[PDB]
C-alpha cells in the first residue's frame, strides 16, 4: 500500500524525514531523523513537545497541509532545531480517506526559490 | 523494491501533476494528473517539454540537479506559465542505484510560514 511505498522511499532518503497520521501519531521516522533529533533515547512525540516554537508552527502547517492545501507546497522555513536551521516540507497523501502526512527536513540553505 | 518503483507508486494518484526523469533527460514516468493536465492529446511528455517557452529556469535547475552527488536540495521554480496558468514546480534528485532520477512536482503555489 501507499504507507509501505512511502516508507521505502523515506528510508532511502538522505535527510531527516518522518510519516505521521491524522491523529498526530508518528508512524515512521527514518534513520537520519533519529540521528539528528532523537539522541536522548526519546520518542518523536516527546521530542516534538520539547520544541515549543517548532511544535506550534508545524502543528498549524500540518493542519493546513492535509485539510486544505493538498495542491499547495507547504513549507516551514528557517526554523532553528538542534544547532541548525531547517526548512521542512509537509505533504499529505491519501489511501482512501486515510491521510498519511510526510515531513521532509532540508538544511534551510539547501532550499532555493527562483522565478521562471 | 526499486526506489524508482516505490516513488512511482507514491505519486501515481497523488493530486498534483508529477513526473520522473532520468539523468539523461528522458521522461520515465508521468502520473495520472500529469497526463490529464498536460498530455491531453496523448503526445509524448518530450514534445510537450520542447514546446514550453517559460522553461529556461526549470531546465537550468534540472541540469544542475541531474549531476549532483548529494540528494538533499529542494529547488522551487516559481510562477512558471504553462498553456494558460501558473505553476510552482519543485525539483528534487533521488539516488536510484548509482544514477540520479529527477522528480518534478507541480503545485498551484508555495505557502511559506516562518
Swiss-Prot record, chain A:
A single BP term in Gene Ontology = regulation of DNA-templated transcription
Q: Where in the cell is it found?
A: Cytoplasm
Q: Which GO terms describe its molecular function?
A: DNA binding
Q: Residues of the signal sequence?
A: none
One GO cellular component assignment for this chain's record is: cytoplasm
**Which key words are in the record?**
Activator, Conjugation, Cytoplasm, Plasmid, Transcription, Transcription regulation
Instruction: Name the major location.
Output: cytoplasm
**What does the UniProt record say this protein does?**
This protein is essential for positively regulating the expression of transfer genes that are involved in the conjugal transfer of DNA between bacterial cells.
Protein name from the UniProt record: Protein TraJ
Give the organism the record lists: Escherichia coli (strain K12)
Which taxonomic lineage is given here?
Bacteria, Pseudomonadati, Pseudomonadota, Gammaproteobacteria, Enterobacterales
Name the gene for this chain. Answer: traJ
Q: Which residues of the full protein are shown?
A: 16 to 131 of 229
Amino acid at each position: 500500500d501507499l504507507l509501505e511505498n512511502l516508507t521505502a522511499v523515506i528510508q532511502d532518503y538522505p535527510n531527516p524525514a518522518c510519516i505521521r497520521d491524522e491523529t498526530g501519531k508518528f508512524i515512521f521516522c527514518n534513520t537520519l531523523f533519529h540521528e539528528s533529533f532523537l539522541t536522548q533515547d526519546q520518542s518523536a512525540e516527546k521530542w516534538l513537545l520539547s520544541q515549543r516554537d517548532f511544535c506550534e508552527l508545524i502543528s498549524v502547517t500540518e493542519m493546513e497541509a492535509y485539510r486544505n492545501e493538498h495542491t499547495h507546497l507547504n513549507l516551514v522555513e528557517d526554523v532553528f532545531i538542534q544547532n541548525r536551521f531547517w526548512t521542512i516540507s509537509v505533504q499529505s497523501f491519501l489511501n482512501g480517506h486515510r491521510n498519511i502526512i510526510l515531513w521532509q527536513f532540508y538544511d534551510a540553505a539547501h532550499v532555493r526559490h527562483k522565478d521562471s
